[PDB]
Design a protein around this ligand. Structure first.
Ligand code: 9FG
Length: 245
């Protein structure tokens, strides 16, 4: 019985729309406001998803929140890359059904470079022939891939929970074929982190200058970006990497 995989498939968030008006000509303010609102909508789903993961409540309740808050960006990028792979074969970024980015929107959003990398991430799902099951366990493992340098309140329970998720990834892979596969997947998991960092910087700078540019940041978005993201950007909170960068 595939108990672990059953849980992941069962708790996997459905479609989330951004509420973007696609009848109005593209503007930087409207495009970035819709992404932020999508971020907010998505956060809600990421919280409910993470809280339903196997063993997640073994974590200290305060570590539960931190982990979600540090990981959210990378979790969203990775899932978005998947959506883009399965819906449009990575030809465009499928943020939401009502928010698909072509190259014009990539350019109008002033985050073309970040978009380029995200789309490259999406292409990798196709290049490496990632299975939905690999995707599911990789995404779960992403939640436990970023922690403070000073450690969590109960680090031991995190370490065990992360160890078990790596073991689960091992299992859906399962000797030279497996060692090759594990190498490829962990390299893929590592590649999400520099991308998330670029989006962390962009979203942070944007929050600071938000009033100047008429870009709206929803309550939960503005809080994380100003309280938790600077902890990452200042080097206090760091990715866990499989390979040396
Ligand atoms: C909505 N979204 C996804 C998804 N799905 C990945 C990255 C972002 C994002 C980008 C810039 C920003 O200012 C706010 C954001 F929420």
């Amino acid at each position: 019985q595939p108990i672990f995989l059953n849980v992941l498939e069962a708790i996997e968030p459905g479609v989330v729309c951004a509420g973007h008006d696609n009848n109005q000509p593209d503007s930087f303010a409207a495009l970035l406001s819709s992404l932020n609102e999508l971020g907010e909508r998505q956060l809600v789903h990421v919280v409910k998803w993470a809280k339903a993961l196997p063993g997640f409540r073994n974590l200290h309740v305060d570590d539960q929140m931190a982990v979600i808050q540090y990981s959210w960006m990378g979790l969203m990028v990775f899932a978005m890359g998947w959506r883009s792979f399965t819906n449009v074969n990575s030809r465009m970024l499928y943020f939401a059904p009502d928010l698909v980015f072509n190259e014009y929107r990539m350019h109008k959003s002033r985050m073309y470079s970040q978009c380029v990398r995200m789309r490259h991430l999406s292409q990798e799902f196709g290049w490496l022939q990632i299975t939905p099951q690999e995707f599911l366990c990789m995404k779960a493992l992403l939640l436990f891939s970023i922690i403070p340098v000073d450690g969590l309140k109960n680090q031991k329970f995190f370490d065990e929970l992360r160890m078990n998720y790596i073991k689960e990834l091992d299992r859906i892979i399962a000797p030279t074929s497996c060692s090759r596969r594990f190498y490829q997947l962990t390299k893929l998991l590592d590649s999400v982190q520099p991308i998330a960092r670029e989006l962390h910087q962009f979203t942070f700078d944007l929050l600071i200058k938000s009033h100047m540019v008429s870009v709206d940041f929803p309550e939960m978005m503005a809080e994380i970006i100003s309280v938790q993201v600077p902890k990452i950007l200042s080097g206090k909170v760091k990715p866990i990497y499989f390979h040396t960068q």
